Design a protein around this ligand. Structure first.
Ligand SMILES: O=C1NC(=O)C(c2cnc3ccccn23)=C1c1cn2c3c(cc(F)cc13)CN(C(=O)N1CCCCC1)CC2
Ligand SMILES: O=C1NC(=O)C(c2cnc3ccccn23)=C1c1cn2c3c(cc(F)cc13)CN(C(=O)N1CCCCC1)CC2
Ligand SMILES: O=C1NC(=O)C(c2cnc3ccccn23)=C1c1cn2c3c(cc(F)cc13)CN(C(=O)N1CCCCC1)CC2
Ligand SMILES: O=C1NC(=O)C(c2cnc3ccccn23)=C1c1cn2c3c(cc(F)cc13)CN(C(=O)N1CCCCC1)CC2
Lengths: 332, 332, 327, 325
């Protein structure tokens, strides 16, 4: 049913390629992975998701190979998905090359839809576990953002690489963690969208723990125990917490032009990037932040002038995972 | 001119699959990786250079069959060896049996010699682990492979997700290192061969440094900085150095007639696993160690009874990169 | 003693698995069969030959009680491990749309004959020779017999079974293994089974369509209960007809095609008594290439063991065969 | 959940072993196969008085290395028709007619059920027909060869003639032919067409059914038309059992009804072989429908008549009034 043509980089190690569905002429994305045919976690998770900001699962099928053999005729699972041409990663580097900041309306739209998508996932009990700009699909014309790449997602049963966006509890080898690790990533994406470069760029985990400490300050004994208990008494150098207003001072200087956006973005950044995972602002709660107040005004449009994408038709599971204060605030 | 059938696994990015050469009837391994024909492939150029009894032979290579494409598929054809040190180890583990000292000697020797040659060309493998060490049970030949991470370390430049066998300088944001990182791996493999489990098994960059310190002791201020200068004044908790006979006490206990095997292996383990990369015993130099004296006796055989594999017909390049003291000891 | 791992497949009446010998690190095959004395193990203890699997060890494993139930007892036969079969090598070339090179057809057929000649010299009949039983190492191109669950001093296969067996014969000779040798030479040259019928009737017809009608007397040397039994009358075809297309595609100014087919005709004969004996076959011109000193594997390597005949092998070779076979 | 113990033998593939369910103490049979299965998928569909119940299934791993066992758990019954047969054979005695009727009936009803789901068993033989000596219940088992036949195993004596001619395509009638061979052996004390090979067997079939016509031959395998086969005359079933009919006599139509039922089963043309659910209404089973009939033990007869809706749907109207007592 599909013409496979041209490789779109690499997903969860498996290969992702462009494809045309011959019945409709439409282009789709096909991630082919090597499964053992006697159960694939990513595809079972994909079958559950339905949300305005998650890639649609379209079809799936196994490659034939034909060559039988009393060893392993391998077999390849083909997951067919909605094709969206860009990522938040690309839009950023496009603005970077232009030495220009992403407009605050796009930063608001992207962070919102990322938060809403990750809240749904967490409401189903699913943790994406590898949120980074390279996974946040974007449509330049409608500025829809969709989640994708669920090769690392998992239903965290009580009892991954890409290092710039991992939660600090992960870099300390926490043997147990919560869905909050995605919230730390949300903070890192929002952070990079505002800064023009990663907030905590470091080659290894040691290198990053330092850079996080050089900003959040030295973690307390109690904070350290909420991340990894085995390190409750592991002492770090005593660094005093630096504050966002300072790090972005130059950006606030050059850009800022009659906007409280910078105050709201940095406040929202603070509520995401917290050592104690339980103290991190939950994603569906975050939708109510004043940073998104612009998106609920009726006269707000895309910079193009076109209409805003889907933002407000919350499902009941979305509403159920919102505090009463949040439920009143989000109604546009 | 190959019948491609059955996937062996995932190498550096690409997939490796078994294949039959239709001209000779022989079985080979084909690693298919996603190249860009407009650029150069590092792994293939490196392999094109290697000729050594303990490196996989490069047999052939070819590209497999629009604008906006660019992404083509490089097919590298190599010698097929059906096992790894990884598989042999987990084999003995299940039997609650220690790998015999004759094999621990054979494998570590051939690994050192393969890595000594590699260094003599200026190449660094950068990801030595049991899974890369091909083994043939019948001859107990060991060969290096998986050169997707190899590189001719050029002073002045700058990310691997292999966890247990990386050198401490790598787990700090080093950005400059030497071929000594391969020697640290040699130590971890020899360590695991003797212990039945990884010497420093911890899931993250941070957890492992901790596990290494609980054994090697806290690094001195100068030992740090020969690893990563950016962390010279970084103090760790004060751990006392453990004794290898302590870690191996139970293994040393069970195996009666300790002989110098345990003493020579632990002396050789000590000379590999050193914080300062510059103080680590060089791989060809290691060949002359007393641990391998059994390999040089004329009456020594494999446990099967068969003859020992290639061990001593050193090339001229090997000799030039051996201290004169080592050469008289190594040539039997 | 042994670490048991991968299941390689199914032998005669049991499962065969990979295993590591803990003393040596070597990989071996263990055939575990239900000992509910074995014949196969007695047969295995006798065999020593370059082209038979080595018997390495054996031990019993029991599950349950005894006088209570019937518990279980299992014979575990430990053998030399070879990683491929002729069956696998064949299907590999088939997928490639390629003929097995004549040097490998020579090597495999030669070594198969020698093992079966030795086996027969002991008076043993293998009784189930097929590509799945002919172990091969691509690296050396050594061929070894295995799977002796049917061997016997005088089956569920059908494609490589002799015509006498498929006629229900009660008595047979060791020449049933020579028919199987030819059906393997045939598949190596045709790229597909010479006689491939699902059943034990469909198969005789496909044989008849090539060998012609067995004479009144020929049918009597196969199964006497069928002498005066008439079959449809087909005229015998010629192997050069059946292989005409292959002989064209593979061309060459070599006598291999003529020599290979001359050997096929001498193997595949209705009369068991007229079939070329396995050790006599070694002297056939087909294997003259193997006796040249300059010959190598296609790889470039040395040829496997081919000529160091034991004294028993020599006793079962005609004097003409002895001068032709010693290089 | 299970203690795996004594090995009972080999089914279509894999080994079957005795086992105890630790929860109930009950004994069950576990078929362990090396694996979406077909046999397990088919087993999951069947629920009928004369098919083994599938109780459970579970997989064991054993290994964890780069480059599985299905365990099918079933109702345990300690005998087969095969084992009951050798019992009377060794006893120099014929299987009682009430038992022949019971076994053939339950077998027909089980295969009739199986066909109504579109499944073909393809390897019915005495060794597959479980029996309980106490109740004389018969249940089908060993579905490793079953398949639904959307248009290669070594079963010998009970294969249909179209199968022994390797017919690339066939119908569920092959199970009907086996029913006939099982009934036949129950009456004769030995296989009807026992031969070392297929050749020996067609020869034995030809010596009884006579030489097949071209069109009969074309309903089996279109190939081999007008090809081979001497002129052999059809023999008579009453001749074959003449010695048995003497010794027994009985003054009963049992021998006539059995041989009539044998004739309607063992026919070259597959479409002309008596369908199984039809077979239940045959006069042979009239005794099983009498209220005063009991087992030879004195006990009650097993389940025989409480037909599901599908069983009724595949019975001719004449058959339904004949079968309901
Ligand atoms: O349309 C889609 N539906 C999906 O599910 C899906 C998908 C599936 N797995 C992953 C993993 C990461 C990112 C996206 N995906 C795509 C899909 C859409 N592009 C992709 C690209 C590579 C790729 F591999 C998959 C996709 C290239 N590209 C991109 O911007 N990149 C790739 C990595 C570096 C920069 C960020 C532009 C569009
Ligand atoms: O025969 C060969 N010639 C080569 O060049 C080569 C090769 C190329 N890249 C790599 C990376 C790692 C190891 C080997 N290779 C192989 C090659 C040989 N086996 C391989 C296996 C997987 C694979 F993907 C490649 C190969 C499985 N296996 C094995 O023990 N494993 C795989 C990883 C976990 C356990 C260790 C058995 C032999
Ligand atoms: O190493 C060995 N030493 C022995 O004695 C021996 C052995 C014992 N019984 C039999 C029966 C048939 C073939 C070989 N054997 C083996 C042995 C070696 N492989 C085996 C395979 C299955 C198996 F079941 C046994 C073995 C798989 N395979 C293979 O190519 N196949 C299996 C059947 C279909 C295709 C042909 C690759 C290697
Ligand atoms: O209790 C059960 N529930 C099932 O499903 C089932 C079963 C599963 N597969 C097959 C295949 C053939 C026959 C029965 N089965 C049994 C089961 C019950 N016996 C079995 C015997 C062997 C065996 F392997 C399985 C079973 C021995 N025996 C028997 O009379 N034999 C065995 C073959 C030669 C003579 C006939 C008496 C009881």
């Amino acid at each position: 049913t599909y013409d496979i043509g041209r490789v779109l980089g690499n997903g969860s190690f498996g290969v992702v390629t462009e494809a045309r569905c011959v019945d409709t002429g439409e282009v789709v994305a096909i991630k082919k992975v090597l499964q053992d045919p006697r159960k694939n976690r990513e595809l079972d998770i994909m079958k559950e998701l339905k949300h305005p900001n998650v890639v649609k699962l379209i079809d799936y099928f196994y490659t034939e190979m034909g060559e039988r053999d009393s060893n392993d005729h391998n077999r390849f699972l083909n997951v067919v998905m909605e094709h969206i041409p860009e990522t938040v990663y690309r839009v950023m580097k496009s603005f970077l090359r232009a030495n220009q900041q992403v407009p605050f309306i796009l930063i608001k739209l992207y962070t919102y839809q990322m938060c809403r998508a990750l809240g749904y996932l967490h409401a189903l009990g699913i943790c994406h576990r590898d949120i980074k700009p390279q996974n946040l699909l974007v449509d330049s014309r409608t500025h829809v953002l969709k989640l994708c790449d669920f090769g690392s997602a998992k239903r965290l049963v009580p009892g991954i690489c890409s290092r710039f966006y991992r939660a600090p509890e992960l870099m300390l080898g926490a043997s147990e963690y919560t869905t909050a690790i995605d919230v730390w990533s949300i903070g890192c994406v929002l952070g990079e969208l505002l800064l023009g470069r990663p907030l905590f760029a470091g080659e290894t985990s040691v290198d990053q723990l330092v850079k996080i400490i050089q900003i959040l300050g030295t973690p307390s004994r109690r904070q350290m125990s909420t991340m990894n208990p085995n390190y409750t008494e592991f002492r770090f150098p005593d660094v005093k917490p630096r504050e966002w207003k300072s790090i972005f001072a130059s950006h606030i200087a050059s850009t800022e032009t009659n906007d409280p956006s910078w105050d709201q973005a940095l406040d929202l950044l603070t509520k995401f990037l917290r050592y104690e995972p339980g103290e991190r602002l939950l994603p569906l709660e975050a939708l109510a932040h004043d940073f998104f107040d612009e998106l609920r005004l009726p006269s707000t449009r895309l910079p193009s002038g076109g209409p805003l994408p889907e933002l407000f038709t919350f499902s009941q599971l979305e509403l159920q995972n919102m505090s009463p204060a949040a439920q009143v605030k989000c109604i546009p």
